[PDB]
Amino acid sequence: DPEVTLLLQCPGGGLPQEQIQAELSPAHDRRPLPGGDEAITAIWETRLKAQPWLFDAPKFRLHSATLAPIGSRGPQLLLRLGLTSYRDFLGTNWSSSAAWLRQQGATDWGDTQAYLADPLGVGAALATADDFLVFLRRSRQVAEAPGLVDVPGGHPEPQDLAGQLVVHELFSSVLQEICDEVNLPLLTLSQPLLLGIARNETSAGRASAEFYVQCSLTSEQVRKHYLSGGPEAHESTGIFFVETQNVRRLPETEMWAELCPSAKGAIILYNRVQGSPTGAALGSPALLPPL
Numbered sequence: 001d002p003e004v005t006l007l008l009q010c011p012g013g014g015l016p017q018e019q020i021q022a023e024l025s026p027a028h029d030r031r032p033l034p035g036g037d038e039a040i041t042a043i044w045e046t047r048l049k050a051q052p053w054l055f056d057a058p059k060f061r062l063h064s065a066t067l068a069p070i071g072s073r074g075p076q077l078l079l080r081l082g083l084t085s086y087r088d089f090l091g092t093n094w095s096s097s098a099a100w101l102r103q104q105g106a107t108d109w110g111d112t113q114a115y116l117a118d119p120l121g122v123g124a125a126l127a128t129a130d131d132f133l134v135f136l137r138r139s140r141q142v143a144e145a146p147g148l149v150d151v152p153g154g155h156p157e158p159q160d161l162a163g164q165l166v167v168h169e170l171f172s173s174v175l176q177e178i179c180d181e182v183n184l185p186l187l188t189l190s191q192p193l194l195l196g197i198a199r200n201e202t203s204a205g206r207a208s209a210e211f212y213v214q215c216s217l218t219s220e221q222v223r224k225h226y227l228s229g230g231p232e233a234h235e236s237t238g239i240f241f242v243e244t245q246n247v248r249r250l251p252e253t254e255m256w257a258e259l260c261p262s263a264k265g266a267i268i269l270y271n272r273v274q275g276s277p278t279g280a281a282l283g284s285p286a287l288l289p290p291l
């Protein structure tokens with residue numbers, strides 16, 4: 001799958017909030033464009049003159065993420081974050097010239113991402129009490145990945161002594177996106193575990209943090225909550241469920257060709273970090289079938 005690359009695989013079946021540090025610094029921001037950021041302002045002005053109800057919003061930027069030595073005590077991950085915006089995303093990652101900006105960043109900074117907004121997304125492998133994962137169908141009328149299959153998530157808007165509040169907002173945001181789109185009560189959700197970070201090579205290498213969240217409701221009860229909101233309650237056009245048993249071989253199915261890159265990253269990291277058992281019991285052939 002050339003449209004998705006793994007930047008980080010978390011250890012221990014996934015990291016809880018209390019094991020992650022963030023450094024939010026202007027050293028982690030996008031670099032100004034070689035010929036000036038006026039090119040971003042021009043694209044934004046053209047867009048507002050066609051769609052004047054659009055609004056800008058701040059976003060977190062991923063610079064890098066460093067994992068501790070495996071099996072160590074103390075904090076296990078450092079997230080290096082900067083700030084960006086929807087406007088800067090439309091002028092860089094979304095631009096027809098995004099590949100030229102990546103080549104220029106290699107030349108000038110030894111960093112293909114130096115001139116890219118690279119807003120940080122969040123997504124979830126959301127599991128039911130009866131052992132299914134939750135999938136969403138996108139509208140065929142949206143600009144990005146029209147008509148494809150997705151998982152719950154989004155791109156959090158901002159607001160270790162500013163660090164811990166940022167980690168808290170990332171974990172909070174994946175639960176809020178599940179409650180807003182799937183219409184689940186907050187008290188049916190587990191604290192999330194970070195599985196890893198995936199890059200969308202179809203959007204000039206922007207990254208998403210991918211989480212595991214467990215729901216106490218069955219697949220039928222999740223379906224009821226989603227539908228009982230009515231069409232105005234969700235951006236997606238449908239919900240459906242795949243047994244965790246069958247998620248193992250999803251990349252060999254016709255569904256895989258319909259999955260957006262973001263959602264492919266969530267399922268690869270689920271299979272690697274929560275699936276793939278390590279011990280004698282779950283690794284026995286009757287529980288882990290060959291092939």
Ligand SMILES: CNCc1ccncc1
Nearest residue numbers: 121122123153154208262
């Ligand atoms: C746009 N779809 C939301 C999303 C899903 C998975 N990862 C990141 C974002």
